[PDB]
Amino acid sequence: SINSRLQLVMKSGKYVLGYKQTLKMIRQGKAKLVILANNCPALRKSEIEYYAMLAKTGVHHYSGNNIELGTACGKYYRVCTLAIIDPGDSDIIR
Amino acid sequence: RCRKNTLARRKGRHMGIGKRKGTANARMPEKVTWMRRMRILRRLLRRYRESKKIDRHMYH
Amino acid sequence: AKRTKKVGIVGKYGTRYGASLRKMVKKIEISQHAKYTCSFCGKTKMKRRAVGIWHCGSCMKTVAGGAWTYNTTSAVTVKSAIRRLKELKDQ
Amino acid sequence: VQRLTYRRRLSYNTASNKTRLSRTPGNRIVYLYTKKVGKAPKSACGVCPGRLRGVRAVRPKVLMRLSKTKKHVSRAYGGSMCAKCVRDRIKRAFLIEEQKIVVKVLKAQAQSQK
Amino acid sequence: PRKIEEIKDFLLTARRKDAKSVKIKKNKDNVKFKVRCSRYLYTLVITDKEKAEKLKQSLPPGLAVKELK
Amino acid sequence: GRVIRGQRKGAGSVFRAHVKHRKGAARLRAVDFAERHGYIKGIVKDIIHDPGRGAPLAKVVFRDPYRFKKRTELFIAAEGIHTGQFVYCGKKAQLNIGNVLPVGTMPEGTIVCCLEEKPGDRGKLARASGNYATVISHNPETKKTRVKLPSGSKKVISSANRAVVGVVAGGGRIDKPILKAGRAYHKYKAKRNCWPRVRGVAMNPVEHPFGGGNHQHIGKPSTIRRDAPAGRKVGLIAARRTGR
RNA sequence: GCCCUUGAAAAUCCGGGGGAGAGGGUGUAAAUCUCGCGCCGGGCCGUACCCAUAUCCGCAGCAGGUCUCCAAGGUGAACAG
RNA sequence: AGUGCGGUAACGCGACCGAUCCCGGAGAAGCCGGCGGGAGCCCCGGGGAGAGUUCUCUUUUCUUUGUGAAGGGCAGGGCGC
RNA sequence: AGGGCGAAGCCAGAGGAAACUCUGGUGGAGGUCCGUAGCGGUCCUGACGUGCAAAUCGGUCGUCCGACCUGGGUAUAGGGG
Ligand SMILES: [Mg+2]
Ligand SMILES: [Mg+2]
Ligand SMILES: [Mg+2]
Ligand SMILES: [Mg+2]
Ligand SMILES: [Mg+2]
Ligand SMILES: [Mg+2]
Ligand SMILES: [Mg+2]
Ligand SMILES: [Mg+2]
Ligand SMILES: [Mg+2]
Ligand SMILES: [Zn+2]
């Protein structure tokens, strides 16, 4: 499961939550992975999906809706897009 | 003659129980009295915060 | 039960209309004024606009739903059946 | 106190008969009749509830008088559509066409395979 | 009406074909110069008195120059 | 004596329908090559309220496939429709909700509404509010389909004739009590002059056949022939059985 | 906030997408949903006064009826008296 | 070469070609509550000009104390930019 | 007009192991109450009863955000509306 591996990333690794910030992380070429909630707007997703394709970056569609993902980042707010810059000691990146 | 009497009403006069016809809330509405207070205390709080007297968390 | 023991939303109606009717209204009267979650952004803003039409204020997604609920049960059960048959037809 | 009368034969207080008080140089309060409140145009997108920027919200038969620059804005879809909905239309219309090309490529490979 | 800020500009407006009366209001502390045209009544505020007295001479062919009192 | 309230509703006049603010008819798309052979795609531009109607409607806009021109329709909203959704329709339409396709295509047990009673009629059966029909069974030859209507009846139908998949939106309207007479008044005012209704027992015996008497009684049997001249046909018409 | 109520049409006016066309050939052109200025025009009918314990309708200068706008000080909850 | 230019952008600048065609907007929206801003009026403290009172008292009480539209500037509101 | 009652939602504090409950606020619901204009028309079986009036007057009354009141336009005509 992905929730478990994220937990560790959020604890120990470096990361960034949200679309304005993750698109800046990909555009820098630092972002190693991009998680998308399922409810994300369709235009947004396809835009991000293209940005990863240009930057040769992983894109993982999360199983849950943006409330679940934010819950799954350990935040009381809700996150639709999340980039993983440096995982701490997790194998979120395979 | 009125002006003179209004000056009496300032001193606190012709204003006792037996010269009131309206309910207290009609005479000074509780909502307005509340509105004043919030608009005071809140104004006091954000002045305190914006002088670094009190921190974010205290303020809240 | 701060202000009322057992009328809540239907305390507006006062004594009128009878106990059963007012109890019967309390169910709907609640649900219809409820703010639901916009399964589109995920904010709690799905609010009935008029009968059968619910609008997210943020999402701006107007959504044909039930008369007093964003979803009827009937609609939900119909949805799943159609999805099942769709898969049965095409394979 | 100076009370006053309407200046036109329309007695009734209506959408048409709206007024305001004005002190003249003659030092008499007089009614002036007021012009209706114009609205800025809403977006062609139709989801963005907010009305458009950089346009003189004025009663539509005025626009006639106004200069072109007042009536619009320097952009593609200028003064017809809000920016946000343009820059989403743009990248949408682009990203869509890139996938249409990808499906065309996957179709052509499948023809060459078969 | 229209206020003007350059003594030259008012001189150019006064020199048009459409113009006529160029009445002059000594307000004390101000001395305006109101020059009527077809459309607009142009005015020009000239704070100095000697500069207003100088301009008085500079209006051209025999316009009204109907000084106001 | 008098022409009775009831006979009078036929002349229209006061009893005609109120239709100023009504947003239009709530049809289906008309058939054409695209509908007939493939599937035309349109988008749901908005969802609407239509006075005197419990179902909400849906402005659905397509592209006319002949003139450069964006034609638009008023579908009755299938429940679970929303804006910025696409609404495909035709023979080769995908069997999901808010998607109008011929009854012959769609499998058995398939729930539909706004279902064409006769091919090309533009959507006549089951278009109320919480209502729908179910496609029972197909006869491939004869090109006919059996459909179960909300009344219970099991009507036979041409397999060509279309329907929107899913039930009608705004269901369970009638679970809420009305309570206030006022609330009744406000319902029928956006419809037609049919409300506060006076019982023929109340009336004098010139304006209704139950009228008159020293006691508000009917006096004759309240069941009646349907070979009955208009003016008597009152109470329970052709009532097969009458009680609880 | 309320609605099993969802609360006018049209004339008229504008914006945008498109890009069929048009412009002159190195001082000018077509162009100004023209910017600023300049010139000429805007016909037809209504326009007195009353509008109500005396100009209206109730046979009348009839205690009846007849749609609106404006709306000072004091007392007082108050357009109450 | 030349169917204007500025701003990261919201957008800006006095003008800035363009047809049939298309899309959009404005015209074009219920009632009720609360709160806020702007005026008119009222109020208070004073300046003046004219008043009334004055047997005694009263720096008195009373009146009056202005700037149209249209432009330009600037507050002051609002913004789901 | 102006008052009364104070429904949902919201805040804090206190208790509760939890479930949740109490206390104080805020909030302002309603074919809610009082009560003006408005609309009406209970009683006095008052006045009047060759009247002010071919149905009026006085007090007293009902209702006063809603099946509210109301102008103009428009529809329905006689065994018909
Ligand atoms: Mg008019
Ligand atoms: Mg502009
Ligand atoms: Mg009777
Ligand atoms: Mg009979
Ligand atoms: Mg006159
Ligand atoms: Mg008068
Ligand atoms: Mg009597
Ligand atoms: Mg007598
Ligand atoms: Mg008399
Ligand atoms: Zn937009």
| Contacts with D78 (C-beta within 8 Å, 6 or more apart), sequence order | D72
Cα D2 to Cα D5, D11, D33, F115: the distances in Å are 10, 19, 18, 70
Six token digits for residue E33: 């110069």
Q: B6 beta carbon < 7 A from strand G?
A: yes
The answer to whether the CB of F195 falls within 8 A of the CB of F184 is: yes
Q: Rounded to the nearest whole angstrom, what is the distance from the C-alpha of residue D54 to the centroid of ligand 2?
A: 4
Apex CA F25: angle with CA F22 and CA F27, to 5°? 150
- CA C16 to the chain's CA centroid: 25
- CA E49 to the chain's CA centroid: 13
Residue count of chain F, please give it: 244
The H-or-E segment that residue B47 falls in is helix B30-49
For chain D, where are the E strands, in sequence order? Answer: 19-23, 29-33
* Torsion sign across C-alpha atoms F105, F111, F112, F116: positive
| Contacts with F153 (C-beta within 8 Å, 6 or more apart), sequence order | none
Q: A65 touching C, CB under 8 A?
A: yes
The H-or-E segment that residue B43 falls in is helix B30-49
Distance of alpha carbon F113 from alpha carbon F43, whole angstroms: 19
Residue entry with tokens 């620059």: D69
Six token digits for residue F40: 């035309």
Nearest chain C residue to D48 by CA distance is: C60
Q: A46 touching D, CB under 8 A?
A: yes
Subunits touching D (CB < 8 Å, at least 3 pairs)? A, C, F
- Asked whether at least 3 C-beta pairs link B and D within 8 Å, the reply is no
Residue entry with tokens 């406000």: F186
Alpha-carbon Rg for chain B in angstroms? 19
Distance of alpha carbon A47 from alpha carbon D95, whole angstroms: 7
E29: left (phi over 0), alpha (psi -120 to 50) or beta: left
Six token digits for residue E39: 């459309």
The answer to whether the CB of C51 falls within 8 A of the CB of F52 is: no
Alpha-carbon Rg for chain A in angstroms? 12
Give A-chain residues touching D91 at CB under 8 angstroms. Answer: 43, 47
Count of C-beta atoms within a 10 Å radius of residue F149: 17
Q: First CA to last CA across chain E, in angstroms?
A: 21
Q: What strand order describes the sheet that includes A81-86?
A: A14-17, A81-86, A33-36, A58-61
3-state helix, strand, coil in chain F (%, to 5): 10, 25, 65
Residue entry with tokens 């992905």: A2
Six token digits for residue A91: 């194998």
Distance of alpha carbon E48 from alpha carbon E30, whole angstroms: 7
- CA D33 to the chain's CA centroid: 25
Cα C30 to Cα C34, C35, C52, D54: the distances in Å are 6, 10, 16, 43
| DSSP category for residue D56 | -
Nearest protein residue by Cα to C1' of nucleotide G78: B22
| Sequence-ordered alpha helix ranges (H) in D25-82 | 60-63, 68-71
Of C24, C64, C89, the CB nearest to F79: C64
| DSSP category for residue D30 | E
The H-or-E segment that residue E63 falls in is none
DSSP F36-83: HHS-EEEEEEEEE--TT-SS-EEEEE---SSSS---EEEEEPBTT-BT
Count of C-beta atoms within a 10 Å radius of residue F70: 12
**Diameter over CA atoms, chain E:** 31
Which nucleotide across the nucleic acid strands is nearest to D75, CA versus C1'?
Answer: H11
Strands E41-44 and E2-4, bridge-based pairing: parallel
Six token digits for residue D42: 């809403």
For chain F, where are the E strands, in sequence order? Answer: 40-48, 57-61, 72-76, 86-89, 100-102, 110-113, 133-139, 144-148, 154-158, 162-165, 223-224, 236-237
Distance of alpha carbon F80 from alpha carbon C72, whole angstroms: 10
Bridge partner list, F82: C63
Distance of alpha carbon F187 from alpha carbon A33, whole angstroms: 57
Distance of alpha carbon F2 from alpha carbon D62, whole angstroms: 60
The answer to whether the CB of D88 falls within 8 A of the CB of A43 is: yes
| Contacts with F225 (C-beta within 8 Å, 6 or more apart), sequence order | F233, F238
Q: F155 touching D, CB under 8 A?
A: no
Which nucleotide across the nucleic acid strands is nearest to D61, CA versus C1'?
Answer: G13
- How many angstroms is C1' of H33 away from CA of B26? 18
DSSP-derived 3-state class of residue C33: helix
- Asked whether at least 3 C-beta pairs link A and C within 8 Å, the reply is yes
Distance of alpha carbon F73 from alpha carbon F71, whole angstroms: 7
Distance of alpha carbon C45 from alpha carbon C60, whole angstroms: 10
Distance of alpha carbon F90 from alpha carbon F33, whole angstroms: 9
Six token digits for residue D21: 């008080």
Q: D42 beta carbon < 7 A from strand H?
A: yes
DSSP-derived 3-state class of residue E52: helix
Cα F46 to Cα D41, F60, F83, F115, F165: the distances in Å are 19, 7, 6, 22, 19
Q: What is the resolution of this structure in A?
A: 4.2
Strands C53-56 and F133-139, bridge-based pairing: unpaired
Apex CA C57: angle with CA C53 and CA C63, to 5°? 25
What are residue F211's phi and psi, to 5 degrees?
-60, 180
Question: F201-227 burial by CB neighbour count: b if 16+ within 10 A, else e?
Answer: bebeeebbbbbeeeeeeeeeeeebeee
DSSP-derived 3-state class of residue F101: strand
DSSP F7-21: TGGGG-TTSSBP-SS
Experimental technique behind these coordinates: cryo-EM
DSSP A2-58: HHHHHHHHHHHSEEEESHHHHHHHHHHT---EEEE-SSS-HHHHHHHHHHHHHTT-E
The answer to whether the CB of F105 falls within 8 A of the CB of F96 is: no
**Rounded to 10 degrees, what is the CA torsion of E2, E3, E8, E10?**
50
Q: Which of F97, A43, D47 is nearest to C55 (CA)?
A: D47
Q: Rounded to the nearest whole angstrom, what is the distance from the C-alpha of residue F151 to the centroid of ligand 8?
A: 75
The answer to whether the CB of A31 falls within 8 A of the CB of A24 is: no
Amino acid at F63: R
Six token digits for residue A53: 């394709």
Apex CA B45: angle with CA B43 and CA B48, to 5°? 110
Cα F63 to Cα B54, F41, F68: the distances in Å are 62, 8, 7
C18: left (phi over 0), alpha (psi -120 to 50) or beta: left
The answer to whether the CB of E44 falls within 8 A of the CB of E3 is: yes
Six token digits for residue F117: 């009673």
Which nucleotide across the nucleic acid strands is nearest to D69, CA versus C1'?
Answer: H13
